[PDB]
Amino acid sequence: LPVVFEDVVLHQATILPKTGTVSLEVRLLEASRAFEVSENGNLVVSGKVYQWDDPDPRLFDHPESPT
Amino acid sequence: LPVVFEDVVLHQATILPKTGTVSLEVRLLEASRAFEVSENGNLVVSGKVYQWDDPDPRLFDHPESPT
């Protein structure tokens, strides 16, 4: 699956504890091409994710050097 | 449940069939306080819906008429 992300925003940083686990939940809206990651009911990440329909190898050609 | 809608948007109008039925699917992201209604996988309505924490009757008092 070649994927495309857009307008990714990180609202808060989750801190992994030394002992235990943290549960991260992902909810997708296929129609609106929007996603949302949450922890304990608190929004942590949001943006837009959808499949890349027509990949272009041109995109990954290395850009002209700053120097 | 006193509810508050916000930034509601309608993308298309569904034509109720004369014969048969039409099924609408609604999805909520409680963390983002957003909702989407999809018809056959097509976005129809979008916005933000959340519970009204502190209702106040003063809001519904009729504004004085300019005439």
Contacts of B27 in chain A (CB under 8 A): 27, 29
Resolution (A): 3.3
Reference B32, options A42, A9, A13, A3; nearest CA is A42
Question: Is B36 within 8 Å of A41 when comparing Cβ atoms?
Answer: no
B38, closest residue in chain A (CA to CA):
A31
In angstroms, the CA B49 to CA A45 distance is 19
Task: Tell me whether residues A29 and B41 touch, CB distance under 8 A.
Answer: no
**Chain A residue with minimum CA distance to B47:** A32
Q: For every residue of chain A, which 3-state class applies, written as one string?
A: CCEEEEEEEECCCCCCCCCCCCCCEEEEECCCCEEEEEECCEEEEEEEEEECCCCCHHHHCCCCCCC
Q: Residue B66 carries which side chain, given as an amino acid letter?
A: P
